[PDB]
Design a protein around this ligand. Structure first.
Ligand SMILES: [Ca+2]
Ligand SMILES: [Ca+2]
Ligand SMILES: [Ca+2]
Ligand SMILES: [Ca+2]
Ligand SMILES: [Ca+2]
Ligand SMILES: [Fe+3]
Ligand SMILES: [Fe+3]
Ligand SMILES: [Fe+3]
Ligand SMILES: [Fe+3]
Lengths: 162, 163
């Protein structure tokens, strides 16, 4: 029932979620190497969340009578020059995902595909919220300047993510 | 007491092979879901998650021994097979090779006098053999069905119940 161009768009986004999951796990490998157990735990939770979103795209594609094709996953970066540098990359990554989602929303609307528009709305909202969470983290980091006190507070807080 | 670099390399290689395995199994789910076998598809998704849990077990052991993990590119998996049996044959061939891989690391760790790593791999060795034999039992059932839709579907319901 879903148009091939819209199915292709959802399949591209599914693969982007997978890569996104992988980047975060790679961010985990960096924080774990640097001894920040709380940051690494948060990244691992984020990787798990992105995987659940990919699976949401997976099952929606099959619900609309399409088919999922899994593409190569490129090697993610594994090193950053500081906690701030890592979260800068996450924000840059996340802004791009949001843009991609917006563009699929436009493609579905031109196709007059109501279901797909509705489906993507929840992800639009989740992406906006994630972007802001990363921004608030970077604001805290920039305002702390170097003070390790704030960096350990944030390791503790994020290490509690359920 | 931190792990040697070669034992580190091999565990990290195995970590990445558990990641590909998890992705391969998910790709098999895309095939069964497209062919209309919800039960087979469900089993492959469970297996893909389990392989991720194995990858993360390697992940945390490497850091416990003061090593680090490097994630490599994940190759595109096959997305199509010529039949239910063709898919499960590739699954068995994959798991067979993983079994030899685990035993290879086990000998390398012993050679390196790394009793901690040898003891860690024991659980995986033991579980790798069990699940290689579970995949062969499935594949054997489908060959003894030959054509029979009736038995293929009963397999689909069976694997569809995996918790
Ligand atoms: Ca994402
Ligand atoms: Ca293709
Ligand atoms: Ca646009
Ligand atoms: Ca979230
Ligand atoms: Ca198993
Ligand atoms: Fe996502
Ligand atoms: Fe995201
Ligand atoms: Fe395994
Ligand atoms: Fe396996």
């Amino acid at each position: 029932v879903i148009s091939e161009k819209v199915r292709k768009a959802l399949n591209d986004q599914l693969n982007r979620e997978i890569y996104s999951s992988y980047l975060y796990l790679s961010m985990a490998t960096y924080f774990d190497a640097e001894g920040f157990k709380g940051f690494a735990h948060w990244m691992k939770k984020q990787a798990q969340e992105e995987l659940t979103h990919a699976m949401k795209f997976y099952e929606y594609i099959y619900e609309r009578g399409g088919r999922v094709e899994l593409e190569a996953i490129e090697k993610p970066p594994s090193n950053w020059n500081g906690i701030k540098d890592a979260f800068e990359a996450a924000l840059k990554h996340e802004e791009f995902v949001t843009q991609s989602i917006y563009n699929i929303l436009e493609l579905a609307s031109l196709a007059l595909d109501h279901a797909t528009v509705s489906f993507l709305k929840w992800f639009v909202d989740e992406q906006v919220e994630e972007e802001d969470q990363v921004r608030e983290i970077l604001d805290l980091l920039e305002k702390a300047f170097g003070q390790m006190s704030v960096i350990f507070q944030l390791d503790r807080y994020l290490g509690q993510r359920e």
